[PDB]
Symmetry: C2
């Protein structure tokens, strides 16, 4: 029952790559949320200064 | 034998849910990228108006 064996190895590889992609995107989300925090701080500085 | 069938079922199922998660994350990324673009243009404009900074 090989066709089954090839399918399983094919699926284990896809699973490994999907786990990789999930890890990559989580990091990109953390990094972007950190970026948002820093920009929000810069804008707050400007707005506060512009306000008076 | 039937174990192979069970493993095939398990993997197709785990992969389906990982794909769903990948799609969710990519939407969140796209959303954060758009929030960043709006913030960037606001900051770039203040730099220009107040500091004489062009990109």
């Amino acid at each position: 029952m090989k066709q089954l064996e090839d399918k399983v190895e094919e699926l284990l590889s896809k699973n490994y790559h999907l786990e990789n992609e999930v890890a990559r995107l989580k990091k990109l989300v953390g990094d972007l949320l950190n970026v948002k925090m820093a920009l929000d701080i810069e804008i707050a500085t400007y707005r506060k200064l512009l306000e008076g």
